[PDB]
């Protein structure tokens, strides 16, 4: 099977600074007509693939001059120079040389930046909700970076397990922050049993864990 | 142009059969040859193979013959993506790409279809209010959000004041739930100000039910 093997999975990088992504394949590239084809794709969040560089490398129509590809045999190299907000996606070769074509696994682009807090907020469950017999506690840590962040339920302040979920943004295309939702669900029977929930987040933005918890319950 | 217009996500359960059409724009469709590649969720992509747009001889992957057929529409500049006997593996979102014959390139990706093979059946969405604050009405900006659960399949759409709303604005990835249904949430960053003068509603959509709610927080 023809494997093609992209180094960096993940890439973060500066805004302004070079980025190299290198692709491996198992067999050479090299085609009996002389002629390499490895080519570079992006694709951008919500979006479809988009060529970039073409036969090792020629840069496809509407492709800046910062991206660049170069290589040979079964070594091969894109760079993105001075890199920008516009550049965040996942960036894959694909090999056309060969029986049926295939494509690396990815790598994501992703911002350097500053590091910021996120702004913890916490949403009880509604009535509708909860006059239907389900509780639902949200959890929000919002912009913040880097992406690693921490969030601990406690109720009756006992650090609550296995009954809570959560979603983070894809970094935002002007700020490079991530937004984190957590929600932990319980039954309105268990939701009663107790009185105070709180979601205790820790981000290395923060000098010492923050929590947040409402009243009732 | 290159334009393609790929039709609409599908929802079947194991051992049926879908169709999925690529229409391509005129002086687009046989100057390209148009290839499927599979995307799997959380998978790479894969080349299903092709169809000569001029002759109508369709190539089939080796890892793709016996249920799925390539066949075109020439009068209409379609192309079609048959799978019979369907199963869970199928479950992926195919794409349609044209392809140009001398550089080997993919040089137009088109939307993509999604394909869910699942024995369950549409379930339209719940949404409960996410309240700025219950007794927190004033400090800059303030919570305010909408919830949407248990529902199937995806996707959901969430817009805010009939996509009035766009600042702030923070739709999270949906998260499957132990019951196999799905949850997310759309949170929108607002200032504790308007808090009263500005009415907000989430509008949410659900296609695969017909569902189309709104609710004010
Ligand atoms: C006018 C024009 O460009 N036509 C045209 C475009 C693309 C293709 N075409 C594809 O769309 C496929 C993809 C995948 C593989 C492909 N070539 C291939 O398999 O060549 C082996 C062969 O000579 O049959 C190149 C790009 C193959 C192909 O020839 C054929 C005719």
């Known amino acids: 099977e023809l494997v093609m093997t992209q180094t960096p999975l993940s890439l973060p990088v500066s805004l302004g600074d070079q980025a190299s992504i290198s692709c491996r394949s198992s067999?050479?590239?090299?085609?009996?007509?002389?002629?390499?084809?490895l080519h570079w794709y992006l694709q951008k969040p919500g979006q479809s693939p988009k060529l970039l560089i073409y036969?090792?490398?020629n840069r496809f129509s509407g492709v800046p001059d910062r991206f660049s590809g170069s290589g040979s045999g079964t070594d091969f190299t894109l760079k993105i120079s001075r890199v920008e907000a516009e550049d965040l996606g996942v960036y894959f070769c694909s090999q056309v040389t060969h029986v049926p074509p295939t494509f690396g696994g990815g790598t994501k682009l992703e911002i350097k930046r500053t590091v910021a807090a996120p702004s913890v907020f916490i949403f009880p469950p509604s009535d509708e909700q909860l006059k239907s017999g389900t509780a639902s506690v949200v959890c929000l840590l919002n912009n913040f970076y880097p992406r690693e962040a921490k969030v601990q339920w406690k109720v009756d302040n006992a650090l609550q397990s296995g009954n809570s979920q959560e979603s983070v943004t894809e970094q935002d295309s002007k700020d490079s922050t991530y937004s984190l939702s957590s929600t932990l669900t319980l039954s309105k029977a268990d939701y009663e049993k107790h009185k105070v929930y709180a979601c205790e987040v820790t981000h290395q933005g923060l000098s010492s864990p923050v929590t947040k918890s409402f009243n009732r319950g | 142009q290159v334009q393609l217009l790929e039709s609409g996500p599908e929802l079947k359960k194991p051992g049926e059969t879908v169709k999925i059409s690529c229409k391509a724009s005129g002086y687009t469709f046989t100057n390209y040859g148009m290839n499927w590649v599979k995307q799997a969720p959380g998978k790479g992509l894969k080349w299903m193979g092709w169809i000569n747009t001029y002759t109508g001889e369709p190539t089939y992957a080796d890892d793709f013959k016996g249920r799925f057929a390539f066949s075109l529409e020439t009068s209409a500049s379609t192309a079609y993506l048959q799978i019979n006997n369907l199963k869970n593996e199928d479950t992926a979102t195919y794409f349609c790409?044209?392809?140009?014959?001398?550089?080997?390139?993919?040089?137009?990706w088109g939307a993509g279809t999604t394909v869910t093979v699942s024995s369950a059946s549409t379930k339209g969405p719940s949404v409960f209010p996410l309240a700025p604050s219950s007794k927190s009405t004033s400090g800059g900006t303030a919570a305010l959000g909408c919830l949407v659960k248990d529902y199937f399949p995806e996707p959901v759409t969430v817009s805010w004041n009939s996509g009035a709303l766009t600042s702030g604005v923070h739709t999270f990835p949906a998260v499957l739930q132990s019951s196999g249904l799905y949850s997310l949430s759309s949170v929108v960053t607002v200032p504790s100000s308007s808090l009263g003068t500005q009415t907000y509603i989430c509008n949410v959509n659900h296609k695969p039910s017909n569902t189309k709610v709104d609710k004010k927080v």
């Open positions: 036969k090792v490398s």
């Open positions: 790409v044209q392809a140009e014959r001398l550089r080997r390139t993919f040089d137009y």
């Open positions: 067999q050479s590239l090299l085609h009996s007509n002389g002629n390499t084809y």
